[PDB]
Each structure stands twice: as structure tokens, then as C-alpha cells.
Amino acid sequence: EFQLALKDCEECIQLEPTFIKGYTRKAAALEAMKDYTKAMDVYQKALDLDSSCKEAADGYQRCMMAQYNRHDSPEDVKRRAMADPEVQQIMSDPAMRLILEQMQKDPQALSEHLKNPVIAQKIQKLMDVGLIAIR
């Protein structure tokens, strides 16, 4: 019940921000669900409290590779990424749709648009979830 592990770990963490175990339990649930990008970020928060911590360091290193190795079929990417309301908003927003079309057609559109954080972070989110690959 990896989802429920996340909600109770999050309350634990807000109550006790230094409880490294709250973070390793949350991150393990995220890693198990193949949400390696957030699992790594949660394990890293655990490392920020204690850089020597075993799950915080080891889970972090597994996520570091697995978050790319799992992309496989684009269907996995769409089903998982679009579960996240933030990327749903990015894609439902027509301004972003227009920006993305220019980006596919012109690498310089990317060079220029990404200088402004309001766009650069919408793009960064789509890249983080694996929807936008950069070669």
C-alpha cells in the first residue's frame, strides 16, 4: 500500500522534519512504485539530514539509474506522468502546447524560451517525468 505509506510518512516528516526514517520509508514506497524521481528526492532529503544513512544513500543511488532505465515504452511514461496534475496542467494549457511545437521544430526556440523560468520549469517538469527527452 505504497500510497498510504506516503501519506503517513508525510505527516510524520512535517511533525518531525529530522526524522530520517520518515523519509526513508516514504522514498522506499516511491521507489517501489517506480517513482524514482521523487524517491531520489526524498532519499536525498534524508541524506541532507545524515549523509551516511544507508537507505538514504543506497535508495538514492538505485533511483539515480532506475529513473532512466525504466522509461522503456512511451505508454509507461504517459500513464505514469499524466497521473501527476502538474503535467496535466502543462499539457492542458494551450500556451505550452504552442511553445512545445516550436521547440520540436526549432532547437533555438528551446535555447531562447528556456531562459525564462516560467517556461523553463514547465519544461523541466516534463523532462523530469520523462515526457520530454533531450538528445
Residue 85 or 117 having the CB closest to another protein: 85
Burial 117-129 (b: 16+ CB within 10 A, else e): eebeebbebbebb
Q: Does 135 bind another protein (CB under 8 A)?
A: yes
CA dist., res. 34 & res. 30, Å (int): 6
Q: Does 103 bind another protein (CB under 8 A)?
A: yes
Residue 56 or 132 having the CB closest to another protein: 132
Burial 83-103 (b: 16+ CB within 10 A, else e): ebeebeebbeeeebeebbeeb
Please report, as residue ranges, which positions from 71 to 100 form the binding site for another protein (by CB under 8 A): 74, 77-79, 82-83, 85, 88, 91-92, 97, 100
Q: Taking CB under 8 A as the rule, which mask of x and - marks residues 1-40 in contact with another protein?
A: --x-------------------------------------
